[PDB]
RNA sequence: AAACUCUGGUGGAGGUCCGUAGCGGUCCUGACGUGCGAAUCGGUCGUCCGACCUGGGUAUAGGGGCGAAAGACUAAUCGA
RNA sequence: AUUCAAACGAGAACUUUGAAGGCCGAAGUGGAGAAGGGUUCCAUGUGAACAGCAGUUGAACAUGGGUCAGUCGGUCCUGAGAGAUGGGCGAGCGCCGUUCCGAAGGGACGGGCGAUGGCCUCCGUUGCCCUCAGCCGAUCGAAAGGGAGUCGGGUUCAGAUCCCCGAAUCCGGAGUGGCGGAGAUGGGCGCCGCGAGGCGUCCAGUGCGGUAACGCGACCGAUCCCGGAGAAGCCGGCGGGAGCCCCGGGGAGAGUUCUCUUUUCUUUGUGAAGGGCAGGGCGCCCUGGAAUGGGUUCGCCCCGAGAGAGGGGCCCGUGCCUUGGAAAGCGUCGCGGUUCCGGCGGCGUCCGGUGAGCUCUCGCUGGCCCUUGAAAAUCCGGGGGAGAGGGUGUAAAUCUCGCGCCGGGCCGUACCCAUAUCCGCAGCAGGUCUCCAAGGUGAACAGCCUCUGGCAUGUUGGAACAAUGUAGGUAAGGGAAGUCGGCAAGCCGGAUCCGUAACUUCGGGAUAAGGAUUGGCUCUAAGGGCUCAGCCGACUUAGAACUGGUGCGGACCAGGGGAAUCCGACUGUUUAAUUAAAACAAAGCAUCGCGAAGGCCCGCGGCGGGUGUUGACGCGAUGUGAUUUCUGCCCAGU
């Protein structure tokens, strides 16, 4: 696993060709954005609540989204 | 207390059979076969007793 | 029931002579007793040198007397320091009031020759 | 305090091996464990590693010496003898 | 192991190839690491210098002596032993040396030896005290020790 | 006076001692003696940091091997 | 060490379930392996035979089932050794020998020539010539040594680091290299534009930072050369980190509740691989210059060859946090699928403190040796600088940086692993290599009791309680009178405080001998951390009072002593299965041979072999047997 901290490289990895799926783990106090690539599972944990759905729609539509719970 | 066993077929306490305990997410202790500890390079001067710096052991 | 007995051992019950099977050194190794004592006393001296209560020269000589098994515990050492701080402070007062008596007559003498070089 | 009367290092052998053998090993066993002053660095660190081999724990310099002593008397007379024939041949 | 005299890894510079040849001499007492050892006919006469016997003066204390020219040393190489160059003979190129046994021998002048006595002398003076010490001594050499008469 | 000597600690040597596991096998001349067993069992014992104990690998073969030596051992077989 | 009831069944002392009473008691009657066994594993069925009574049961019998791997081993490496070829020997099968009497390399770089394939571009392929080479002894030899890289959860009647799910990782490969990034893009000049900039020429560029230790994501380079890692004994002490145990709380569920107990019990988590931080370690650097010497350890040890004191650097971080990761696991409460269900929900998975504690591990530091405690595969660094690449650009050669793509074959894998799966003719009290290890008492991995787990008393039951046994005990008065003989049994026993002789190699003897004390309870005193005072924290010693039918190491555990003789100094070893000794060994002592074409010895043979990877402080052959004190006379005989 690899923890992505800053926000803009996440969507840079999300648009890779080997990025198979993204998952939304919405637990309390965090919303993690797990994106499964070929070698790693990159994670983008953001503490903000509304900025999550600021990006949840920003994903490329080709990649399969998955609300995880 | 939970007594635990080996996980390979080597049942002797040889130097290639060293272990360490580990608590798994399943709430159980298991063995984890460790790697032998490395050593950093010794100086080519052949007289300094220490080992080199800046290189991984 | 075990908890009820260890609570009594804390008060010293069931630990008389007739309930001890191992030698005194086996129950309490004298090496670790000496270890506890050294680490304690050396640490005490290391705080006193740190807080300027004692100097290097007193620390070093007092260090070896700890190693020499002179002081039995922390209180006996701490009071022995007080007597060393006291007596040298007397000697510090006695050797400065006597030096003040000496250096005063030094220039009080020089003032006297100062009247000789001016009149001649 | 002085723990023994006349049995030094060889007190470890207890009552074994007889008095004379325990006495003539004392002079040797004191020597083979003594630390000598390294003639190269000056520090008292020359200590016997193995029989005949003497290592200085400070300058890390190894010296071929006697078995139980640092210098064999037979060797020091030979070093001084060679030193005379050396300057006598070349003049 | 199994030898009283210590050895000495001496590193030379091969004169024909770019290489460093290493040897195992028998350390002469007084040798120390980082010391320069000189070998050959023009080598000076100091402790730990192998040079042909014919070049040495009389009464020179040598060790690791060659019994035949070029056999890499055979004589006087136990701990603390040595041989003395008794006398030369310019013609016929021969030299008399006495051996640690007391026998005097006429060897060729060409064969060489390292100057000085063998390190590790005086080993036989310390008494083996225990049967155990004797067991460990021979366990490093060969199966010969417990000797039923 | 010196040489050094006393006293208290520290230290942790040793084919060191008591003693467990282990390895042994002293005595009862105990049990058993068509046995549990073609050599075992009980109590009592020896040793237990070393000439220690042990698995596997490997070497030595019959007038040969191997033997801290008892003609011991060499597949329940050994003066062949 | 069994008992009651029930179920199944023709049939129950023996099977199964439930209850009760017990045992193993973490050095196990527990949980897993190696060797060996070879289907004994698992399910269903049967009750002939077999399981020394029985059997509704079985490791029996009859049907069927069952072992899944790039990551765990084998495979690879070498060890002691084994063993071909050359050679030698040999009537001969063959033997010796393993670098020795040998033309022992079939490889590589570059260059030159010819040739081909794909956009015969450029590269690959091939032949020839030239140039270079130390290789060095074929090959075999370890399921415990060396050896890159897999972990978590789930799943079966029986298999899981192998299947499923989810997270990784190592190695190998890639004309057109699949993509980025690095290499890399600067300066001088002459003009234009007010400038902001942009042109046309010339030149540089195989990275960069830090006083340094060294750092940064990469950061050209061959033959050759040097080095490192692999790669190291035993023992002691101490320190760090875990796991376990313990203590004080908080939840969840259970047990007790005649009385008491805010109680007793159970349970209360996070993998590999990354990132960060603690925490350990450093003979790492810089400043500076120390006696009135200082620093410092349990011990040590360190210092003008640079101490203290400051400020840095590196290594390991198995601990914590984090990504993984709460989705999963577990604990409870509840709702479903009437069920088939990795069903679906609810909360919870908490906060602290201790330790000469135990085990594991990491590290530091000593001790011991006439003992110095493996090799190789494999991998890496450095020194060198033969060469290679592009001319200011869509830069080239080249990259041990990031990501992407492809592949990882072959064989083992079930179970037993031992008072019933092995060997002893057998379900044989024998034998057979290891790993994990709870609570109480206690010095303790002792013995005794208990929890987790396991079991049915060891190839039968019932009824009696005679003699003889076997194994345990107890005995008035006497106390070895018994007997070859104190054989056997008994006494003694722990600890604390006293006290301790002859003799002695001065070390011992020695727990010598001989005394006293020991319970329960209630107290007092002393021994530490953290911020004078306050707040935390543990165990331990000494003393006092009271008290019991003088009993208190109350079980368990646990030395009879003395004084003399003989032998052997000691420790050690020995007749497996009648002899453990005074025998053997032993250190010590003393002889003897031998300077290598040699001594001793092997061998049918050989330029054979062992000692010998040796050299008189050595090797070989004998006697005696530590120390102490001595060792006399005889060379006629042999």
mmCIF file of C-alpha atoms in Angstrom, chain C residues 6-53:
data_model
loop_
_atom_site.group_PDB
_atom_site.id
_atom_site.type_symbol
_atom_site.label_atom_id
_atom_site.label_comp_id
_atom_site.label_asym_id
_atom_site.label_seq_id
_atom_site.Cartn_x
_atom_site.Cartn_y
_atom_site.Cartn_z
ATOM 1 C CA UNK C 6 0.233 -11.519 48.692
ATOM 2 C CA UNK C 7 -1.555 -8.626 50.361
ATOM 3 C CA UNK C 8 -0.353 -10.112 53.641
ATOM 4 C CA UNK C 9 3.206 -10.553 52.384
ATOM 5 C CA UNK C 10 3.249 -6.844 51.577
ATOM 6 C CA UNK C 11 2.667 -6.254 55.277
ATOM 7 C CA UNK C 12 5.387 -8.775 56.084
ATOM 8 C CA UNK C 13 3.209 -11.707 57.115
ATOM 9 C CA UNK C 14 4.181 -15.318 56.328
ATOM 10 C CA UNK C 15 7.808 -14.259 55.724
ATOM 11 C CA UNK C 16 9.407 -15.133 59.050
ATOM 12 C CA UNK C 17 12.392 -17.375 59.550
ATOM 13 C CA UNK C 18 10.322 -20.554 59.414
ATOM 14 C CA UNK C 19 9.085 -19.757 55.914
ATOM 15 C CA UNK C 20 12.370 -19.192 54.080
ATOM 16 C CA UNK C 21 13.938 -22.097 52.212
ATOM 17 C CA UNK C 22 16.508 -20.383 49.995
ATOM 18 C CA UNK C 23 19.607 -18.633 51.250
ATOM 19 C CA UNK C 24 19.533 -14.881 51.724
ATOM 20 C CA UNK C 25 21.580 -14.445 48.563
ATOM 21 C CA UNK C 26 19.125 -16.624 46.652
ATOM 22 C CA UNK C 27 16.098 -14.645 47.808
ATOM 23 C CA UNK C 28 17.801 -11.300 47.228
ATOM 24 C CA UNK C 29 21.101 -11.469 45.326
ATOM 25 C CA UNK C 30 23.627 -9.201 46.975
ATOM 26 C CA UNK C 31 24.963 -8.252 43.551
ATOM 27 C CA UNK C 32 21.715 -6.587 42.518
ATOM 28 C CA UNK C 33 21.495 -5.024 45.966
ATOM 29 C CA UNK C 34 24.929 -3.541 45.352
ATOM 30 C CA UNK C 35 23.809 -2.659 41.827
ATOM 31 C CA UNK C 36 20.755 -0.757 43.035
ATOM 32 C CA UNK C 37 22.892 1.089 45.562
ATOM 33 C CA UNK C 38 25.569 2.139 43.084
ATOM 34 C CA UNK C 39 23.151 3.339 40.413
ATOM 35 C CA UNK C 40 21.269 5.310 43.064
ATOM 36 C CA UNK C 41 24.287 6.959 44.649
ATOM 37 C CA UNK C 42 26.128 7.655 41.400
ATOM 38 C CA UNK C 43 22.928 9.252 40.119
ATOM 39 C CA UNK C 44 22.685 11.390 43.250
ATOM 40 C CA UNK C 45 26.234 12.679 42.854
ATOM 41 C CA UNK C 46 25.559 13.289 39.171
ATOM 42 C CA UNK C 47 22.681 15.618 40.061
ATOM 43 C CA UNK C 48 24.694 17.525 42.646
ATOM 44 C CA UNK C 49 27.511 18.213 40.197
ATOM 45 C CA UNK C 50 24.834 19.236 37.699
ATOM 46 C CA UNK C 51 23.177 21.659 40.131
ATOM 47 C CA UNK C 52 26.525 23.226 41.114
ATOM 48 C CA UNK C 53 26.119 22.048 44.702
#
